[PDB]
Structure formats: C-alpha cells, structure tokens
Amino acid sequence: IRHANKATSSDEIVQILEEDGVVIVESFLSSDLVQKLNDELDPHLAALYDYHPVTTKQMNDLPARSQTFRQDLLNNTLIHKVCEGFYGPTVGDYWMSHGGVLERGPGTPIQSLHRDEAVFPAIHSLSGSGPPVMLHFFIALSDFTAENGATQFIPGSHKWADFNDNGTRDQAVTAILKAGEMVIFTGKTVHCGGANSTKDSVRRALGMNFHPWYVTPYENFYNTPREVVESMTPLAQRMIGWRTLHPHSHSFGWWLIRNAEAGQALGLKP
Amino acid sequence: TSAIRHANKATSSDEIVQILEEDGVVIVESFLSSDLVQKLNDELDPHLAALYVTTKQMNDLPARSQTFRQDLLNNTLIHKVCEGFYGPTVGDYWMSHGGVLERGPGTPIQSLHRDEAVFPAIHSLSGSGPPVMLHFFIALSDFTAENGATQFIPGSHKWADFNDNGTRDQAVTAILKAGEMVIFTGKTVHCGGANSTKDSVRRALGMNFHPWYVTPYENFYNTPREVVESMTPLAQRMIGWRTLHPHSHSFGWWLIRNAEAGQALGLKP
Amino acid sequence: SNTSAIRHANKATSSDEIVQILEEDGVVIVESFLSSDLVQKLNDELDPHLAALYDPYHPVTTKQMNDLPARSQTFRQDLLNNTLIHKVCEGFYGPTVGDYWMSHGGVLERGPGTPIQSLHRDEAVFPAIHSLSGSGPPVMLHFFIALSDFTAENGATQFIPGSHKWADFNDNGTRDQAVTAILKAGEMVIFTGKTVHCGGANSTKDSVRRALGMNFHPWYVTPYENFYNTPREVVESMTPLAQRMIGWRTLHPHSHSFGWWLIRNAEAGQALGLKP
Amino acid sequence: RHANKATSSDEIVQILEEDGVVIVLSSDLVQKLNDELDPHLAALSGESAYHPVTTKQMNDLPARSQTFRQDLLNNTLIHKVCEGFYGPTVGDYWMSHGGVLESLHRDEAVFPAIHSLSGSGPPVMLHFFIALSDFTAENGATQFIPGSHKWADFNDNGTRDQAVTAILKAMVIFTGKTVHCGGANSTKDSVRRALGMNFHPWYVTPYENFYNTPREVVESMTPLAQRMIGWRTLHPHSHSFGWWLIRNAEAGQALGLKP
Ligand SMILES: [Fe+3]
Ligand SMILES: [Fe+3]
Ligand SMILES: [Fe+3]
Ligand SMILES: [Fe+3]
Structure with missing residues (x-):
C-alpha cells in the first residue's frame, strides 16, 4: 500500500485508489481532532448497553452522537473531493451509508x-x-500495529474478473498508521481485520462507508433530533439522507417529496 | 402476432410470475372490484383538482388515499408477484413510487x-x-387505443443491447377495462399512447417497486404519524418506515442503531 | 312570545316565505339546506387547497380562502346552480333590479382562541x-353555509334582527341585542349587508368552526372578486347561469333591458369564445 | 456545403441539385420564436413524473406562433429556393408540415x-430545418449523406459512415430523397431544438390540415402565407387556370377572405 499524502493532490489520491483499490493518507486528522473525537465518543462507547470485559464494540448513528463528526468529518474537503472523483461522470451524487466507530480489544480473532x-x-x-x-x-483513533491487528489489504483485487476468489493471505499487506491517519478502499477490495495478540491494547477506528445515490444506505437517520439536524450544513444533511440527491442522469432529482425538495418539505431551511 | 397474454380469474400467482419472466408484461383481468375503483377515484379526485394542459401527475398516495394505504399496499397478488419477481437472492423489497397519472384530450404519443x-x-x-x-399499472378508467392505452414490445427486456428501443410496429397495445392491471418490468420497452378523444381523460395508478438495495424515488417521512401508525407493518415497510431483511444481509438493512427502525422511532413492535 | 329569535325555515317552507322573513328580520335560517354527502365532498374538495395555503412567527387561529369556482367542482356545479339561492336572489332584488351576480365566495375557518368580532x-x-x-x-x-356545527361555544355568528331597517347605520347596536345563530349540518343562514352581525369567540380548545359564504351583488355593483384567471376548461364546464354568476356573461337589468357588461354591445361570453 | 450572403439563391438551389443538402435567422427572431413556442411545448400538472419527456414534437404552428405566421411563411429565402427547386413544370407549392422537434x-x-x-x-x-438551438454532434446533429438523392436504388439507405454531421449554431435544407438520420443526444444536460418546414408541390396532399385555425388568425396573414396553409387555390403551370377551387372560383375569396 502507498503511504502517500501531505504533498499529494486529491486527484492523485483518486488515481492510487483506482489503480490499487486502497490508499493511505497520512496525518489526515489533527491530534487535537483525534482527541476531540475520542472524548465525545468515550461516554457513548461506555453506555452501549446502559469480570466480563467486552472485547468487540461497534457503534453507529454518529451524527446524533458526535458534534465533530456532525461538522468536521461530514464537511471534510478531502473526503468530498475523493467522493466526487471516485463516483465520476456517470454517478453524480452520493451519501453516507454507514458511519461507525469500531473497537477490538485483546484476544480478537483474525478475520476472513x-x-x-x-x-x-x-x-x-x-x-x-x-x-x-x-x-x-477508515480513520484512526488508535495506533495501527500488526501486533494489535491492523487491517490487511490485497492491492488490485478490486479489478479481478472473478470475485469468488478472495485471494490467499500471503498476498495481504498490513496498513500501519499511527495518528489520525486514514486508509481509503473500495467495496471491491479484499481485506480482513487482524488478530490482537497483545493482552493490553484496544484497536479503535472510524469507518465512513459511502454509497451512490441509487444504493440504499445501511443507516437510517430520521430519528436524529431535529435541532441537531438544523445545526448541520446542507451538504452534511444530504449525506445523512435529509436532502434530495441530484444524480446527473435524471437531474430533476431523486429521493423527493411530492416531486419537491425533501428537506424543505419537512421543515429544513431551503 | 405476439399479443400481451391476458391472465387472472383462474391463473395462479406463479403463472403471472412466469408470464412476466417470458414476455416482460402481463395483463391481470378484474384485478380491482368496481367498488374499489370508485373509492379510489373518489379519494383521488379532490387531490387531483388542487394540484395546481390536461395531463396530470400526483404521488404521496399514502397520505392522500385510505384505499391506497390499506387495500393496495396490502394486496396479496401484488406481494406474491413481487416475491416471485425478485426471487431467492433478493429477499426484501419496497415501493419506490406510487403515482396517479392523468392524460386527457390532445395528449401526444410518447417515445x-x-x-x-x-x-x-x-x-x-x-x-x-x-x-x-x-x-x-392499474386502470382507474378504460384504457383504449383511442385514448392512448400503453403499448409494449414483449420480450424486449431480454435483448442484448438496450440502446435498441425497437420499432413502433413491434408494439402491442394493452387494452384494459377498469380495475384491470398490467404488470411490466423496468427493462421492457413501452410507451404511452396518444389520446385523440376530445372528451375523455385516461386515469392510471402506477406502483413502482424496487429491490431492497435501490433507493426509492419517494421519501415518505413527512407522512403524518397517525396515518403511518394506522398502516400494517407490511405496508409500513413498503413506504420505508421499517427495516428490510435481505437474504444477503439477513440481520437487516435500513436500521437505526443496529435496531429495527420503526420501533426505534415510536411505532409498534 | 315572551322571547324572540332568528326564524327557521323548514323544507315545507317556500322560498317566498324565506324572502318574507328576510326582509322583516334581515336574517333567516334554512334548515337541512345541504345533504350530508354534499357537505362531505365540499369539505373534501376544500381540504387540499387549504392545506396548501397554510402548510408553512404567528399562530394560525384563522383561515380564509376564495376563488372557489376554480377550486371546487361541487361549488362550480351544485352551489352556483342551487335553485333556492336563485329563488331568494330574485325575490331579494325584485322587479327594478333584474339581474345579479356573485361578489365574493369564501371559506372561513375560526379555530380555538379566535377573539369575538365587532x-x-x-x-x-x-x-x-x-x-x-x-x-x-x-x-x-x-x-352563510355551515360546513361544521355552529355552536355558541365555538362562536356561532350572532345577529341583531331588524337592524337592517335602522335609520342610522353609524349605530351598530350592542352585544345584548344580538341573537346567536345555531346551525348543525350544511344548514344555512341568509342575511343582508345592512344587518348587524358578528362572529363569536371560539372558547373550545379543540373545535374548528368552518363556513362557506356566498356574497351576491346586484348587476350594477362591482364584484369584489375578478374571475378572469379561471381556466377556460372549467368555465366551459359551467352552466350559463353559473357563468353569469362569475362575470363571464352579460347581465340583463330590467332598467336597461338591452344589457350591461357587454363586448361591442353583444353578449360577452359569446364574444370571448363561450357557447351562445 | 455552407452558404452566406455572398451566396446566391440560385447557387443554393444548385447545391440542393448537386449534394441534396445545404447549410445556410435573426438571433432576436430566434429568441422570439423560442418565446412564442415555449408555452405551447410546456402544455404538451407539469407532466414529468421522474420520467422527463425526451423526444418532443409540435405542429399547427400558424395558430400557435405569430412570427412563424408572418416572418417565416413570408421569408424571401424559403420562397426563392422553393421556386428554384420545383422549377418550370410545377409552378405552385404549399406547406405540408410545420413542426418543432426537440435510423x-x-x-x-x-x-x-x-x-x-x-x-x-x-x-x-x-x-x-432551422436551428432554434445549437446544432452539435455532441447533442445529436442530424446526419446526411450527400448525393443520396440521385441514387438509382432507394432501398439502399447507405451506411452510417457516409453521414456527414450538420453543425449549426442558430438552417439546413434538404430534399425528401436525401438519406438522413437524427443523432443521439449524449450531452447530459442540453436539448437540441429545431423547426422543420416541409413543402409539397401543389398536386401532393399536405400532411397538415389547417381549417381548425381560427378565422382571425387566418385573416391576419398575407395572401401568400394563406396559400401556404391551404386557404388559397394553387396555380400550376400545367393547369394555369387553377386548382383546389370552390365552384371553379378562388377558394379563400369564396369562404370570406380577401379578393
Ligand atoms: Fe470489512
Ligand atoms: Fe414509462
Ligand atoms: Fe360580516
Ligand atoms: Fe426525417
């Protein structure tokens, strides 16, 4: 995997993604931003069910849960330019399907x-x-070691003619990152999580999985409180399904209410 | 010539799915009772008059029509044909668009x-x-070639190149009386007809369904909460208020905090 | 005998007696004017239009709507052609006037918390x-047709009978002289523009009072509403009487028998493409 | 081949003879045409239904458009090319098709x-075929095969190579013997709009019937334009006395028009 960022252009990032199916962007989040995310997220990881430690934890509905995810992450300029470059001419519009914080503690088994x-x-x-x-x-919230199980990838596997072949493990490359770094990959790229050999270290990551406008998002964001939705930018509101999508094919729109803009139809500002 | 292959009054739902597989279009006779057609027209008329050219279009039916909310979204034949059409690998489905279409005098023929x-x-x-x-495609009025009944090319959903829309001479007209239905795929070539009649307006009700993984055209979250609460859970899932259960991702899709969505926003279990 | 009220007119009452009560009292109540089915579709035809007017800083205690002929088919056909309304119009304007037309057709909605009217x-x-x-x-x-029940609790309209005959119209009377008009179904109350009246306060926390008013003019008084924007396809669906009511036909006053509201001294509706 | 004002009306009739197709309106007139025609096309609720109308046609222009009624039907270039195309033996002509259009x-x-x-x-x-909008190969320019009007066998429609695209900004003239085809509109936002006027010799039945045109619209037009829409009798060189008459008299005069 190419650990390419800092002086790399977003068009380049899209190019490494299309050639390899995976890319590593160094120092994507400031260390203060990583600390802000962990601070906002820790109480809700502790409350997940209100001498048996829980090794594995998965949490979503981030826009209801984190303000920095509401504003900083959903409006991040690099994520949106990479989305526009990835979807390209034929797609047009996109939204977030799943936003989740992932926790593997000690003893987590290797993934397929x-x-x-x-x-x-x-x-x-x-x-x-x-x-x-x-x-x-796939954003950092803890160190990515091979020892604590950093996610592995097989570059170029997104281009294979037969997806029944998931490859063999010696073809997998581990993605080592430290600070609020990110790894981007397509849904066609073979990958697997690692085994956490250490008894003492928990792997924490934030995944943001985007869809084209025509594929149903995994997450439903309509129980998000109205006041927090009104605090978000219209771009972030479209990302969480509160605004209509604008595919280039049928530019008149999709996800409408009475053939009119959806967010305005249920009380958001135009 | 090909003809449309009419059905119903003794055909099983499996037969309708098979005719749909082979021709891409089928006509179900006597699908709605004359009383149901009269409720539908009565409930729809005031909303059509307030919509503000004889052509008309209208959607957001569940808020507007009780018969659509209860009778149509729960119709057993529609759901048997849906489960037969999407089949094993898909599992779950929902409605993308429910619309009333009106085409009166002077309506041009469609491409x-x-x-x-x-x-x-x-x-x-x-x-x-x-x-x-x-x-x-339900007939709320008579569908005549004189008033522009939809024409179809059977077997065109099968074609190797969709850049070919075929020719107007391979087309078969679909004549429907009232409460009769025509089912077709999104891959079958079709066109609405020209309505020469100086006097008559054609009324249809289209129900366009999607597999679970394709975004519906209509968003129904502004639907009033007590009309959604009046609907059956199946009909609630059709309008996006319940989670889908694809055979692919059996645990569920369209969830709220990895829990059933309709329960998460106050509906009954 | 010790007490007086607005007089009711039942089905066995003739329109001549209604015109009689109207210019002895200035107000009359016509019981069971509209069938329950007519009230039901009238409310049905009016609901989507009101919802589009009022769906969007201000609580809404009050709603109004006009331009009914473009909006409601039952108003276009049933109400605008109603035989009793035309009998009473002919009797009210009488010999010297001859022709009349509608000045204002409006739906009024007074919900909870609406203050009493002057x-x-x-x-x-x-x-x-x-x-x-x-x-x-x-x-x-x-x-004034009642599209919902008219109770004193939701503010049924009050009237002062005989106030249409008063010698000084700077005097509007006092609330102790007003009698409430209680109506249930599509019952109607007819009154003159010279009779003192006022809407009531809606004390109820739950109930909305709804009414449909049709205000008619003699031919020589300018209607409040202009109906030029009514689509031609709907004007052509109307009877010539209803077309004259909305100003698309010439009037025929008894005074100037040749006609009024003409185009090149010829019938107006024919002159702009309607049927002779 | 293109033709400017240094081109003769003669020499354009001579392209039409040689190639079967020619490329030669005020941008203001073009906007006036678009303005008069847009409300009628929109009226063809505002029917979209997630299903926008892609191919559109409209006819009976003289009832619908004043500038088509006066300027276009009386245009000197259309009539010079018509007289040159029909030539001696024909004499008179009229319009079969007036239409907006957007193998x-x-x-x-x-x-x-x-x-x-x-x-x-x-x-x-x-x-x-007048350009009411830009005519590019990217939005689907009508293609033509020059010289196909002279082929000895008309079941040969040629192949799609011989097709030369007709690029216009804001008309192309061709015969009914020239092979042609409209293009595909790849542009995912723009739509090509054209106005076609198809003329016939006097003895061939026009496609359009123009009697439902209201009488005042017919009476405002010049006698030439009234003959173009079938309200006046034709005067063939063959039958120099007249054709399309009422009781052996001029038809338009017989039904209330001018002398
Ligand atoms: Fe994964
Ligand atoms: Fe279609
Ligand atoms: Fe008043
Ligand atoms: Fe052609």
Whole structure:
C-alpha cells in the first residue's frame, strides 16, 4: 500500500485508489481532532448497553452522537473531493451509508478475507467490471500495529474478473498508521481485520462507508433530533439522507417529496 | 402476432410470475372490484383538482388515499408477484413510487423507452441485468387505443443491447377495462399512447417497486404519524418506515442503531 | 312570545316565505339546506387547497380562502346552480333590479382562541350606499353555509334582527341585542349587508368552526372578486347561469333591458369564445 | 456545403441539385420564436413524473406562433429556393408540415409510388430545418449523406459512415430523397431544438390540415402565407387556370377572405 499524502493532490489520491483499490493518507486528522473525537465518543462507547470485559464494540448513528463528526468529518474537503472523483461522470451524487466507530480489544480473532460489496450479490456478481458502489474511509483513533491487528489489504483485487476468489493471505499487506491517519478502499477490495495478540491494547477506528445515490444506505437517520439536524450544513444533511440527491442522469432529482425538495418539505431551511 | 397474454380469474400467482419472466408484461383481468375503483377515484379526485394542459401527475398516495394505504399496499397478488419477481437472492423489497397519472384530450404519443434507463449502471447491463423495477399499472378508467392505452414490445427486456428501443410496429397495445392491471418490468420497452378523444381523460395508478438495495424515488417521512401508525407493518415497510431483511444481509438493512427502525422511532413492535 | 329569535325555515317552507322573513328580520335560517354527502365532498374538495395555503412567527387561529369556482367542482356545479339561492336572489332584488351576480365566495375557518368580532354591517365598504341606512337599496345578499356545527361555544355568528331597517347605520347596536345563530349540518343562514352581525369567540380548545359564504351583488355593483384567471376548461364546464354568476356573461337589468357588461354591445361570453 | 450572403439563391438551389443538402435567422427572431413556442411545448400538472419527456414534437404552428405566421411563411429565402427547386413544370407549392422537434431513412418513403422511382423521381418534398438551438454532434446533429438523392436504388439507405454531421449554431435544407438520420443526444444536460418546414408541390396532399385555425388568425396573414396553409387555390403551370377551387372560383375569396 502507498503511504502517500501531505504533498499529494486529491486527484492523485483518486488515481492510487483506482489503480490499487486502497490508499493511505497520512496525518489526515489533527491530534487535537483525534482527541476531540475520542472524548465525545468515550461516554457513548461506555453506555452501549446502559469480570466480563467486552472485547468487540461497534457503534453507529454518529451524527446524533458526535458534534465533530456532525461538522468536521461530514464537511471534510478531502473526503468530498475523493467522493466526487471516485463516483465520476456517470454517478453524480452520493451519501453516507454507514458511519461507525469500531473497537477490538485483546484476544480478537483474525478475520476472513472478504469484500464488503458481497452484501449486494447483484453487484458482487459483476466482479471487477462492476460500477463503483462502496467507498470506505477508515480513520484512526488508535495506533495501527500488526501486533494489535491492523487491517490487511490485497492491492488490485478490486479489478479481478472473478470475485469468488478472495485471494490467499500471503498476498495481504498490513496498513500501519499511527495518528489520525486514514486508509481509503473500495467495496471491491479484499481485506480482513487482524488478530490482537497483545493482552493490553484496544484497536479503535472510524469507518465512513459511502454509497451512490441509487444504493440504499445501511443507516437510517430520521430519528436524529431535529435541532441537531438544523445545526448541520446542507451538504452534511444530504449525506445523512435529509436532502434530495441530484444524480446527473435524471437531474430533476431523486429521493423527493411530492416531486419537491425533501428537506424543505419537512421543515429544513431551503 | 405476439399479443400481451391476458391472465387472472383462474391463473395462479406463479403463472403471472412466469408470464412476466417470458414476455416482460402481463395483463391481470378484474384485478380491482368496481367498488374499489370508485373509492379510489373518489379519494383521488379532490387531490387531483388542487394540484395546481390536461395531463396530470400526483404521488404521496399514502397520505392522500385510505384505499391506497390499506387495500393496495396490502394486496396479496401484488406481494406474491413481487416475491416471485425478485426471487431467492433478493429477499426484501419496497415501493419506490406510487403515482396517479392523468392524460386527457390532445395528449401526444410518447417515445418508446425503458424506465430503468434512469439507472445507467443497471441499464448498461441490458437484458442480463438484475431485476430492479417492477411496475403495476392499474386502470382507474378504460384504457383504449383511442385514448392512448400503453403499448409494449414483449420480450424486449431480454435483448442484448438496450440502446435498441425497437420499432413502433413491434408494439402491442394493452387494452384494459377498469380495475384491470398490467404488470411490466423496468427493462421492457413501452410507451404511452396518444389520446385523440376530445372528451375523455385516461386515469392510471402506477406502483413502482424496487429491490431492497435501490433507493426509492419517494421519501415518505413527512407522512403524518397517525396515518403511518394506522398502516400494517407490511405496508409500513413498503413506504420505508421499517427495516428490510435481505437474504444477503439477513440481520437487516435500513436500521437505526443496529435496531429495527420503526420501533426505534415510536411505532409498534 | 315572551322571547324572540332568528326564524327557521323548514323544507315545507317556500322560498317566498324565506324572502318574507328576510326582509322583516334581515336574517333567516334554512334548515337541512345541504345533504350530508354534499357537505362531505365540499369539505373534501376544500381540504387540499387549504392545506396548501397554510402548510408553512404567528399562530394560525384563522383561515380564509376564495376563488372557489376554480377550486371546487361541487361549488362550480351544485352551489352556483342551487335553485333556492336563485329563488331568494330574485325575490331579494325584485322587479327594478333584474339581474345579479356573485361578489365574493369564501371559506372561513375560526379555530380555538379566535377573539369575538365587532358588530358591523358588511355594506360599510360602500359609504355612498351605507349613508342612506335603512332607506338604502338592496345590495349585498349573504348566504352563510355551515360546513361544521355552529355552536355558541365555538362562536356561532350572532345577529341583531331588524337592524337592517335602522335609520342610522353609524349605530351598530350592542352585544345584548344580538341573537346567536345555531346551525348543525350544511344548514344555512341568509342575511343582508345592512344587518348587524358578528362572529363569536371560539372558547373550545379543540373545535374548528368552518363556513362557506356566498356574497351576491346586484348587476350594477362591482364584484369584489375578478374571475378572469379561471381556466377556460372549467368555465366551459359551467352552466350559463353559473357563468353569469362569475362575470363571464352579460347581465340583463330590467332598467336597461338591452344589457350591461357587454363586448361591442353583444353578449360577452359569446364574444370571448363561450357557447351562445 | 455552407452558404452566406455572398451566396446566391440560385447557387443554393444548385447545391440542393448537386449534394441534396445545404447549410445556410435573426438571433432576436430566434429568441422570439423560442418565446412564442415555449408555452405551447410546456402544455404538451407539469407532466414529468421522474420520467422527463425526451423526444418532443409540435405542429399547427400558424395558430400557435405569430412570427412563424408572418416572418417565416413570408421569408424571401424559403420562397426563392422553393421556386428554384420545383422549377418550370410545377409552378405552385404549399406547406405540408410545420413542426418543432426537440435510423437512416428518406421522408419520401411515405409515398411508395414516388419512392420506387429512386433518384429520377420528380421533386416532392423540400425540407427547411432551422436551428432554434445549437446544432452539435455532441447533442445529436442530424446526419446526411450527400448525393443520396440521385441514387438509382432507394432501398439502399447507405451506411452510417457516409453521414456527414450538420453543425449549426442558430438552417439546413434538404430534399425528401436525401438519406438522413437524427443523432443521439449524449450531452447530459442540453436539448437540441429545431423547426422543420416541409413543402409539397401543389398536386401532393399536405400532411397538415389547417381549417381548425381560427378565422382571425387566418385573416391576419398575407395572401401568400394563406396559400401556404391551404386557404388559397394553387396555380400550376400545367393547369394555369387553377386548382383546389370552390365552384371553379378562388377558394379563400369564396369562404370570406380577401379578393
Ligand atoms: Fe470489512
Ligand atoms: Fe414509462
Ligand atoms: Fe360580516
Ligand atoms: Fe426525417
């Protein structure tokens, strides 16, 4: 995997992503931003069910839960330029399907090599000729060691003609990052989580999985309190399904209410 | 010539799914009782008059029509044909668009087309693409070639190149009386007809369904809470208020905090 | 005998007796004017239009809507052609007037918390007519249909019978002289533009009072509403009587029998493409 | 081949003879045409239904457009090319088609007895295709095959290579014997708008019937434009006395028009 950032352009980042299926952007979040995210997130990780430590933890509905995710992450300029470059001419519009914080503690087993877009057999059966669907931004909230199980990737596996082949493990490259760095990959790229050999270290990450406008998001954000939705930018509101999408094909719009803009239809400002 | 292959009054739902597989279009006779057609027209007329050219379009039916809320969204034949059309790998489905269409005197003939062309990534797969759009076209009025009944090209959902829309001479007219329905795929070539009649307006009710993973055209979250609470859980899932359960991701999709969405926002278990 | 009220008119009452009660009292109640089905579709046709007007700093205790002929088919056909309304119009304007048309057709909604209205005469808007008080000519004829129940608790309209005959219209009376008009169904109250009246306060925390008013004019008084924007397809669906009511046909006063509201001294509706 | 004002009306009739297609309106007039025509096209609720209308056509222009009624039907270039195209033996002509429009074929295929004669057949259709919007190969320029009007066999429609794209900014004239086809509109935002005027010789039945035009619209037009829409009798050189008469008298005068 290419650990390329700092002087790298977003067009370049899109190019490494399309050639390899995975890219590492160094120092994406400021260390203060990482500390702000962990501070806002810790109480809700502790409250997940209101001598048996819980090794594995998964949490979503981040916009309701974190202000910095509400504002900083959903409006991040690099994530949006990479989304526009990844979806390209034919797609047009996109939104976030899943935003989740992931925690593996000590003793977590090794994961199977897999492709996330396997959840869509109708898309997954086209293998590498298939349209771009899933785009995954995997952000740091703890150190990524091979020892604590940093996620592994097989570069170029997004282009294979047969997706029944998940490859073999010696083809996987571990993604080592330290601070609020990110790794981007497509839903067609083979990957797997690592085993956490240390007895003393918990792996924490934030994944943001985006979809094209025409693929159903995994998360429903309509129970998000109205006051917090009104505090968000219209771009972030479209990302969480509160605004209509604008595909280039049928530019009149999609996800409408009475053939009119959706967010205005249920009380948001125009 | 090909003809449309009419059905119903003794055909099983499996037969309708099979006719849909082979021809891409089928006519279900006597689908709605005359009383149901009269409720539907009575409930829809005031909303059509306030919509502000004889052509008309209207959606957001569940807020506007009780018969659509209860009778149509819970219709057993529609759901049997839906489960037969999407089949094993899909599992769950929901409604993308429910609309009343009105085409009165002077209406121009439509160009031959395929509705699934609004999805270029799917449309470019031509006949080998997955099932996506399933359209139920109910006749709230008589469908005559004189008033512009929809024409179809059977077997065109099968074609290897969807850049070919076929020719107007391969088209078969769909004559429907009232409460009769025509079911078709989003991959089948079709077009609405010209309404020469100086006097008569054609009324149809379209119900366009999607597999679980394709975004519905309509958003129903501004639907009033007590009309949603009056609906059956199946009908609530059709309008996006309940989580889907694809065979692919059996644990669920369209969730709130990895929990059932309708329960999460105050609906009954 | 010890007590007096607005007089009711039942189905066995003729329109001549209704016109009689109307210019002895200035107000009359026509029981069971609209069938429950007519009230139901009238409310049904009006609901989407009101919802589009009022869906969006201010609580809404009050709603109004006009331009009914474009908006409601039952109003276009059933109400605008209603035989009793035309009998009473002919009797109210009488020989010297001859022809009449509708000045204002409006739906009014008074919900909870609406304050009591001041006593008034609707014809104060015409000072040259209003200054003649009870000697003045008939001008406004108001038909107020109850689209919901009219209770004193939700503010049923109050009237002062005989106030249309008063010699000084600067005097609007006092609330102790007003009698409430209780109506249930699509029952109607007819009153003159010279009779003092006022809407009540809606004390209820739950109930909305809804009414449909049709205010008619003699041919020579300018209607409040202009109906030029009514679509031609809906005007062509109307009967010639209803077309004259909304100003698309010439009037035929008894005074100037040749006609009024003409185009090149010819019938107006034919002159702009309607059927002869 | 393109033709400016240094081009003769003669020399354009001589392209039409040689190639079968020619490329030659005030931008203001173009906007006036678009302004008068837009409300009628919109009226074809505002029917979209997530299903926008892609192909559109409209006719009966004289009832609908004043500038088409006066300037276009009386335009000196259309009539000079019409007289030059029909020539001596024909004499008189009228409009068969006035339409706004937004496979290889030949319009004179609708006349099998004429179409069977191939390139030696008499002139019938003359088609003026004006650009109400930009005419690019990117939004689907009508393609033409020059010289196809003279081919000895009209069941050969040629192949899609011989097609030369007709690029216009804001008309192209062609015969009903020229192979042509409209292009595909790839542009994912723009729509090409054209106005076609298809003329016939006097003896060929026009496609459009113009009697439902209200009488005042007919009476405001020049006598030439009234003859173009079938309200005046034709005067063939063959039958110099007249054709399309009422009781052997001029038709438009017989039904209340001018002398
Ligand atoms: Fe994964
Ligand atoms: Fe269609
Ligand atoms: Fe008043
Ligand atoms: Fe052509």
